[PDB]
Design an enzyme around this catalytic site. Structure first.
Site, mmCIF file in Angstrom:
data_model
loop_
_atom_site.group_PDB
_atom_site.id
_atom_site.type_symbol
_atom_site.label_atom_id
_atom_site.label_comp_id
_atom_site.label_asym_id
_atom_site.label_seq_id
_atom_site.Cartn_x
_atom_site.Cartn_y
_atom_site.Cartn_z
ATOM 1 N N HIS B 41 -23.103 -43.461 9.612
ATOM 2 C CA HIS B 41 -23.812 -42.253 10.016
ATOM 3 C C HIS B 41 -23.587 -41.092 9.060
ATOM 4 O O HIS B 41 -24.268 -40.071 9.202
ATOM 5 C CB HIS B 41 -23.460 -41.862 11.464
ATOM 6 C CG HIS B 41 -22.052 -41.384 11.664
ATOM 7 N ND1 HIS B 41 -21.087 -42.150 12.286
ATOM 8 C CD2 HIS B 41 -21.456 -40.204 11.364
ATOM 9 C CE1 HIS B 41 -19.953 -41.472 12.339
ATOM 10 N NE2 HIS B 41 -20.149 -40.289 11.787
ATOM 11 N N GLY B 143 -14.758 -34.448 11.929
ATOM 12 C CA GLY B 143 -14.312 -34.727 10.587
ATOM 13 C C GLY B 143 -13.324 -35.864 10.473
ATOM 14 O O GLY B 143 -13.056 -36.317 9.357
ATOM 15 N N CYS B 145 -13.942 -38.866 11.487
ATOM 16 C CA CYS B 145 -14.668 -40.133 11.369
ATOM 17 C C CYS B 145 -14.293 -40.825 10.063
ATOM 18 O O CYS B 145 -14.086 -40.177 9.036
ATOM 19 C CB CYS B 145 -16.180 -39.899 11.427
ATOM 20 S SG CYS B 145 -16.687 -38.503 12.460
HETATM 21 C C1 LIG Z 1 -14.500 -30.737 25.468
HETATM 22 N N1 LIG Z 1 -13.706 -31.911 25.834
HETATM 23 C C2 LIG Z 1 -13.089 -31.681 27.141
HETATM 24 C C3 LIG Z 1 -14.502 -33.152 25.875
HETATM 25 C C4 LIG Z 1 -15.895 -32.986 25.232
HETATM 26 N N2 LIG Z 1 -16.227 -34.129 24.385
HETATM 27 C C5 LIG Z 1 -17.055 -33.955 23.354
HETATM 28 O O1 LIG Z 1 -17.511 -32.881 23.129
HETATM 29 C C6 LIG Z 1 -17.425 -35.153 22.433
HETATM 30 C C7 LIG Z 1 -18.942 -35.320 22.390
HETATM 31 C C8 LIG Z 1 -19.417 -35.944 23.695
HETATM 32 C C9 LIG Z 1 -20.948 -36.302 23.647
HETATM 33 C C10 LIG Z 1 -21.888 -35.428 24.187
HETATM 34 C C11 LIG Z 1 -23.244 -35.747 24.145
HETATM 35 C C12 LIG Z 1 -23.664 -36.942 23.565
HETATM 36 F F1 LIG Z 1 -24.976 -37.258 23.520
HETATM 37 C C13 LIG Z 1 -22.727 -37.818 23.028
HETATM 38 C C14 LIG Z 1 -21.376 -37.498 23.074
HETATM 39 N N3 LIG Z 1 -19.295 -36.218 21.271
HETATM 40 C C15 LIG Z 1 -19.757 -35.775 20.101
HETATM 41 O O2 LIG Z 1 -19.921 -34.622 19.887
HETATM 42 C C16 LIG Z 1 -20.105 -36.838 19.014
HETATM 43 C C17 LIG Z 1 -21.628 -36.992 18.967
HETATM 44 C C18 LIG Z 1 -21.927 -38.248 18.049
HETATM 45 C C19 LIG Z 1 -22.053 -38.082 16.671
HETATM 46 C C20 LIG Z 1 -22.296 -39.183 15.861
HETATM 47 C C21 LIG Z 1 -22.419 -40.445 16.435
HETATM 48 CL CL1 LIG Z 1 -22.728 -41.834 15.450
HETATM 49 C C22 LIG Z 1 -22.293 -40.609 17.808
HETATM 50 C C23 LIG Z 1 -22.042 -39.514 18.623
HETATM 51 CL CL2 LIG Z 1 -21.881 -39.752 20.336
HETATM 52 N N4 LIG Z 1 -19.643 -36.509 17.682
HETATM 53 C C24 LIG Z 1 -18.709 -37.232 17.060
HETATM 54 O O3 LIG Z 1 -18.194 -38.153 17.610
HETATM 55 C C25 LIG Z 1 -18.287 -36.857 15.619
HETATM 56 N N5 LIG Z 1 -18.565 -37.956 14.737
HETATM 57 C C26 LIG Z 1 -16.790 -36.522 15.535
HETATM 58 C C27 LIG Z 1 -16.455 -35.433 16.607
HETATM 59 C C28 LIG Z 1 -17.195 -34.257 16.704
HETATM 60 C C29 LIG Z 1 -16.853 -33.321 17.679
HETATM 61 C C30 LIG Z 1 -15.792 -33.561 18.552
HETATM 62 C C31 LIG Z 1 -15.060 -34.740 18.450
HETATM 63 C C32 LIG Z 1 -15.401 -35.668 17.472
HETATM 64 C C33 LIG Z 1 -14.645 -36.979 17.321
HETATM 65 N N6 LIG Z 1 -14.096 -37.937 17.201
#
Ligand SMILES: CN(C)CCNC(=O)C[C@H](Cc1ccc(F)cc1)NC(=O)[C@@H](Cc1ccc(Cl)cc1Cl)NC(=O)[C@H](N)Cc1ccccc1C#N
Ligand SMILES: CN(C)CCNC(=O)C[C@H](Cc1ccc(F)cc1)NC(=O)[C@@H](Cc1ccc(Cl)cc1Cl)NC(=O)[C@H](N)Cc1ccccc1C#N
Ligand code: NA
Lengths: 302, 302
Positions: B41, B143, B145
């Site tokens: 990604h 970051g 990942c």
């Molecule tokens: C606040 N607290 C109590 C818990 C809150 N939880 C969340 O905030 C995580 C959050 C939950 C979420 C919400 C809506 C969606 F529809 C899908 C997932 N998820 C994302 O932001 C994902 C999105 C993503 C992006 C790319 C792909 Cl292939 C696949 C995916 Cl699902 N972003 C990453 O995972 C990035 N790569 C790396 C990353 C970014 C931000 C925060 C953590 C991490 C990690 N590690």
């Protein structure tokens, strides 16, 4: 997100670990520049360990009594000397992987990573806190003596602990890299005991803040309390008193969450008086006190 | 003595971590021989992440779109290709610190160490278990990942996990180093959920044995139970059933302590039914299930 007990990457320290053999004793040494540091009791036999005089024992030694092995490559000792409880062996090679480093002594309540080693070979890494009684609760088998504890600051390694011994209760005691013991212990094979322990209050609060940052909020309340009225509850539960200086260190975590330190103290007052009612905080059913404000910041936004 | 959650020394893996930049996205890659592995990604923009077709997106890319940095030294991409959910970038230099390694896929209930990295720079090390629902409970910020999980066996690194994403509940999902997800997840920015979790029964027993080896005995009893009568209690508390194969893996720990597996099952039956009555086991007030029989042996006599 997520909050875990995290160690520093150990690579900078792995290239410094050697094996020091004298007589039939073998343990770990730390090789920096042309000097190997290791626990001085490596010069003891089984009978000397009961009531040694280390000045005597070292004077009766020479450079050829110490075998130093950096992997398969044996190193040549050209000099030796004692620095309080650590022995320093001068060798004919500067360790080419010597990092930028410092020897620092830590304070009770501060954390560091331990690279546990056996026969000069690193076997594992974990985090430790120096308890208020100057012991650590580690994981050390026979032969781990000489393993070091360390922090890392922008590719500078601050060495703060060298492992020497296990106490009767299973806790561990060591020195800083200048050979001065943490706490009232000596490197003699007699049953000594640590002083009584206390919970590090500022670390518990830091950990509660970590829990809020990670979505755990069930323990919060609307109440607040005064600094003095809280210190009274601390003494009843064997917690360290909270200072005005501690509150300012918690500033950044208070700032980030919107929860004032004295509001979080009121939440901690209630957890102590009531317990947890079967619930958990960041995967624990106990109040954790082995995370510093720095460890929290470094993992929760650092 | 002492029992702690211990990671593998991370040095062998630290020399393999690089930073892969494409467009305005930057994450971590793993550099082995002349190939860099990273999450695919990284080729996505903010709008492609909603419903990407990765075959399309990669075909529209070329070697000069990918910036690879091994420290200050930029590496030159001479080829690229997709392997399921990981991207493979061929470079003009074989990483001279490439260790002996394997790509292995792990089983639910098995553990590994995570080297968490940001912009190609390792920031911390910790241990993880693959939960029965194929998530891990880690510590990952934006970051991270491309950070990898790994075990070590006699200076051979078995890579088993690459970090891809965080789920809505805060747990983490990734692939093996062949790009195949653990569990029913896809690398698309939509809210997916894990299946329901269970406690790894064989790990809990291993941990009870660790506790006995370290002098914690308060939970033992004279009673015993049958394999079938225990599996009934397991289902009532959402524990995995115990197999005849699991008992044989616990052989070495049963052998060392004198406590038969089915006698320790009777102790676990009672802790589940009664709780702990304010007491702790190896510093926890919960039953821990993130230690394998192997992790126990390796730390308690290994
Ligand atoms: C606040 N607290 C109590 C818990 C809150 N939880 C969340 O905030 C995580 C959050 C939950 C979420 C919400 C809506 C969606 F529809 C899908 C997932 N998820 C994302 O932001 C994902 C999105 C993503 C992006 C790319 C792909 Cl292939 C696949 C995916 Cl699902 N972003 C990453 O995972 C990035 N790569 C790396 C990353 C970014 C931000 C925060 C953590 C991490 C990690 N590690
Ligand atoms: C069974 N379980 C529930 C808890 C039992 N607990 C014990 O068995 C530890 C045991 C407790 C003890 C007993 C009598 C004494 F009078 C002093 C201490 N202590 C020792 O064996 C010390 C002795 C020693 C030797 C040298 C000096 Cl300078 C200073 C010292 Cl006190 N041996 C080490 O510490 C070695 N260096 C490294 C070592 C060896 C064996 C086991 C662990 C470690 C470590 N780490
Ligand atoms: Na750790």
């Amino acid at each position: 997100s997520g909050f875990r007990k995290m160690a520093f990457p150990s690579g900078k320290v792995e290239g410094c670990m050697v094996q020091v053999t004298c007589g039939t004793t073998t343990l770990n040494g730390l090789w920096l520049d042309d000097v190997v540091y290791c626990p001085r009791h490596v010069i003891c036999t089984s009978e000397d360990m009961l009531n040694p005089n280390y000045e005597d024992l070292l004077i009766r030694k020479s450079n050829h009594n110490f075998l130093v092995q950096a992997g398969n490559v044996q190193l040549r000792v050209i000099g030796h000397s004692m620095q309080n409880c650590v022995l320093k062996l001068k060798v004919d090679t500067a360790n080419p992987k010597t990092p930028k480093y410092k020897f620092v002594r830590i304070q009770p309540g501060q954390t560091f990573s331990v690279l546990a080693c056996y026969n000069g070979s690193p076997s594992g890494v974990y985090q430790c806190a120096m308890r208020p009684n100057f012991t650590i609760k580690g994981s050390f088998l026979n032969g781990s003596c000489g393993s070091v504890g360390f922090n890392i600051d922008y590719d500078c390694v601050s060495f703060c602990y060298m492992h020497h011994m296990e106490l009767p209760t299973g806790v561990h005691a060591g020195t800083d890299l200048e050979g001065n013991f943490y706490g009232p212990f000596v490197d003699r094979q007699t049953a000594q005991a640590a002083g009584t322990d206390t919970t590090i209050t500022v670390n518990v609060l830091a950990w509660l803040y970590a829990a809020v940052i990670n979505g755990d909020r069930w323990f919060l309340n609307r109440f607040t309390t005064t600094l003095n009225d809280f210190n009274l509850v601390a003494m009843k539960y064997n917690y360290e008193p909270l200072t005005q200086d501690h509150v300012d260190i918690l500033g950044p975590l208070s700032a980030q969450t919107g929860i004032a330190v004295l509001d979080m103290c009121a939440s901690l007052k209630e957890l102590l008086q009531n317990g947890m009612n079967g619930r958990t905080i960041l995967g624990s059913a106990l109040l954790e006190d082995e995370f510093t404000p720095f460890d929290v910041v470094r993992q929760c936004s650092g």
